[PDB]
Design a protein around this ligand. Structure first.
Ligand SMILES: Nc1ncnc2c1ncn2[C@@H]1O[C@H](COP(=O)(O)OP(=O)(O)OP(=O)(O)O)[C@@H](O)[C@H]1O
Ligand SMILES: [Mg+2]
Length: 506
């Protein structure tokens, strides 16, 4: 059943599991694998014959998390074109930038449209086409005027997905990913979680970032499993568990800020009963051990943390299923389907429990950034990609992350991990959210500060937080200032970015 292209893999899946459920929209649609496969083939045929899409063309997509986004994403790639999913919330100026930078030749949206994206596409003279799924008796309707897919051969080295990085420690970089990149990551994710055709999940993350796209959507479809999209095209804490129950979910994946919202909802409105999940997954930012504990206690499933990035087509490492090995709080587990090494600044491989930069090598990894010869010369050596993250392997081969090189706090020669300190802040009884960050300091060069959101109806002082930290951290790691606030900025992906927080409180 496996294949070295995503389109090939999905074809094998449809043939093996044609009448199993593939894709539901809560309360509305329920597509089987054969039906979805044919909707995709027919749409790809229309893109080639009627929209003039040629191999290597880039097609931009901007949708909520909807059935048309799924169908058109896979139709674009099937037609040997490259999909460039874009955040629907961008301004017209942002859209103009990303449409130009990706070399998009076509913009797809829903029939309702997206006014800023349409404004940008018109200014750049890029065609705009809408996509609508009506009923089970009809093909997907495309707004382009009136077979041709069948002939098409998908090559592992064809471009398939073009994304930018989240912009956390830099200006977002452009990342081209191939059919082969996608197929490799789908095989890795399916393998480490043993996804099979009886699995089922609800998507709670944006499908324009690789976490929800690769793990939630594509790896499920690649196992013959099922995916449910929320009725309103985005995560809702109120409909999450009803959807998970109704559509027989067996797992879900989310980022720590979304897991915290789900936990809050469990505290204020517990369900009378929860489904028994095989596992709950967390990725994209560190999962504090206390959040892991809270999730296992609330929902009774093992919580497996993974480590991933856009340049790796998502998954690099994960804690294993309990039947294969332990999962370690504070750890992102073992490499899956790729090589990984910890290197010092001279490129020497480090022994266990010695820190260094995490480097990876594998068929899931991008061949290189688009139009950035310098980032490529800096980031790649003999096939290995330098992640920019500092970590170490313990003697079981489990990876422990210390943090991004650019985020470590250098206080008078001692480096502080903001990950470590965050994990402590979240254990304070009255802290609902917390983030540590570096700031300039005239005596030590850099100092650590933090910001916390108190739990509703509690009052928290800087001095309480600091005292609590002093009981749980070496003194040099204790935030010198604690900012108390009602809200922290997070990305569309759900990451709190420390540089933004820092600037905001200074
Ligand atoms: N489980 C985890 N724990 C800690 N950090 C993680 C984890 N999973 C992913 N990360 C972090 O997320 C990064 C990947 O994020 P993504 O590819 O979305 O872009 P970004 O690094 O946030 O943005 P930019 O590349 O523009 O700086 C990893 O390099 C690592 O720093
Ligand atoms: Mg990055």
């Amino acid at each position: 059943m496996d294949s070295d292209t995503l389109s090939g893999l999905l074809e094998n899946v449809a043939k093996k599991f044609p009448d199993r459920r593939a894709l539901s929209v809560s309360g509305k649609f329920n597509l089987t694998h054969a039906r979805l496969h044919d909707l995709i083939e027919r749409a790809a045929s229309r893109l080639v014959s009627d929209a003039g899409i040629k191999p290597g063309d880039v097609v931009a997509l901007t949708f909520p998390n909807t059935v048309e986004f799924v169908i058109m994403f896979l139709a674009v790639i099937r037609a040997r074109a490259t999909a460039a999913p874009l955040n629907a919330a961008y301004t017209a100026e942002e859209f103009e930038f990303y449409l130009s930078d990706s070399d998009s030749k076509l913009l797809l949206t829903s029939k309702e449209g997206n006014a800023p994206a349409q404004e940008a596409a018109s200014k750049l003279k890029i065609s705009h086409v809408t996509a609508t799924l009506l009923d089970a008796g009809s093909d997907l309707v495309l707004s382009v005027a009136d077979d041709s897919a069948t002939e098409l051969v998908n090559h592992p080295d064809d471009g398939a997905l073009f994304l930018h990085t989240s912009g956390t420690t830099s200006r977002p970089k452009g990342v081209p990913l191939t059919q082969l990149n996608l197929a490799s990551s789908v095989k890795n994710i399916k393998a480490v979680y043993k996804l099979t055709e009886s699995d089922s999940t609800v998507i709670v993350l944006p499908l324009f970032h690789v976490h929800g796209l690769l793990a939630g959507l594509l790896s499920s479809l690649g196992a013959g499993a099922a995916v449910t999209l929320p009725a309103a095209g985005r995560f809702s804490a109120t409909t999450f568990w009803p959807d998970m129950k109704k559509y027989n979910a067996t797992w879900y994946t989310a980022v720590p800020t979304i897991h915290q919202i789900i936990l809050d909802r469990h505290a204020s409105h517990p369900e009378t009963e929860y489904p028994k999940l095989r596992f709950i997954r967390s990725c994209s930012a560190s999962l504090a051990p206390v959040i892991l504990s809270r999730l296992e206690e609330a929902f009774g499933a093992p919580v497996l943390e993974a480590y991933a990035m856009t340049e790796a087509t998502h998954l690099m490492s994960s804690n294993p299923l309990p039947e294969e090995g332990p999962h370690k709080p504070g750890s992102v587990g073992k490499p899956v389907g790729q090589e990984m090494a910890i290197l010092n600044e001279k490129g020497e491989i480090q022994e266990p429990n010695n820190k260094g930069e995490v480097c990876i090598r594998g068929p899931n990894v991008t061949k290189g950034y688009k139009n950035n010869p310098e980032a490529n010369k800096a980031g790649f050596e003999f096939g290995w990609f330098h992640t920019g993250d500092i970590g170490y392997f313990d003697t079981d081969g489990y990876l422990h992350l210390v943090g991004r090189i650019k985020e470590l706090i250098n206080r008078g020669g001692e480096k502080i991990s903001p990950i470590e300190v965050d994990a402590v802040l979240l254990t304070h009884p009255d802290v609902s959210q917390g983030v540590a960050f570096g700031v300039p300091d005239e005596k030590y060069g850099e100092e650590i500060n933090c910001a916390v959101i108190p739990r509703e109806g509690t009052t928290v002082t800087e001095e309480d937080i600091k005292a609590f930290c002093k009981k749980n951290l070496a003194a040099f790691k204790v935030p010198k200032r604690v900012f108390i606030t009602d809200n922290l900025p997070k990305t569309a992906s759900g990451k709190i970015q420390r540089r933004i927080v820092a600037q905001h409180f200074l």
